[PDB]
Amino acid sequence: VIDCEVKPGKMAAVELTWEEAKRLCPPGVVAACHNSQDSVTISGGAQEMTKFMAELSAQGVTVKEVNSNNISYHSSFMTEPAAYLKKGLEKEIVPKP
């Protein structure tokens, strides 16, 4: 995560439902984790995320930002790091059931 120059990103746990978040998220910002019945983590780029925060705060919705060290985990931005991790861990992690 650190070594690669991943573009700055953010995350936050919004109160939208899973289907609502999936329908309402524009390109560039996605849902990272399905916390509970009414809590979903949205992660994405800094500018698009800030726009999402303004839009959600405009209507009636509770949005809480999570300290992710300015990294948008579980998104398309993690394509390059994940492959690196695979190459990093292929020679270390023995496969077990």
Q: State which approach was used to obtain the coordinates.
A: cryo-EM
Q: How far apart are CA 89 and CA 95, in angstroms?
A: 11
Q: How far apart are CA 84 and CA 74, in angstroms?
A: 15
* Cβ-contact 56, 26 below 8 angstroms: no
Please name every residue paired with 30 in a beta bridge, in sequence order, or none if there are none: 43
Resolution, Å (one decimal): 3.2
* Cβ-contact 4, 80 below 8 angstroms: yes
End-to-end CA distance of the chain: 27
Helix runs in the chain, H state only: 18-24, 46-58, 79-89
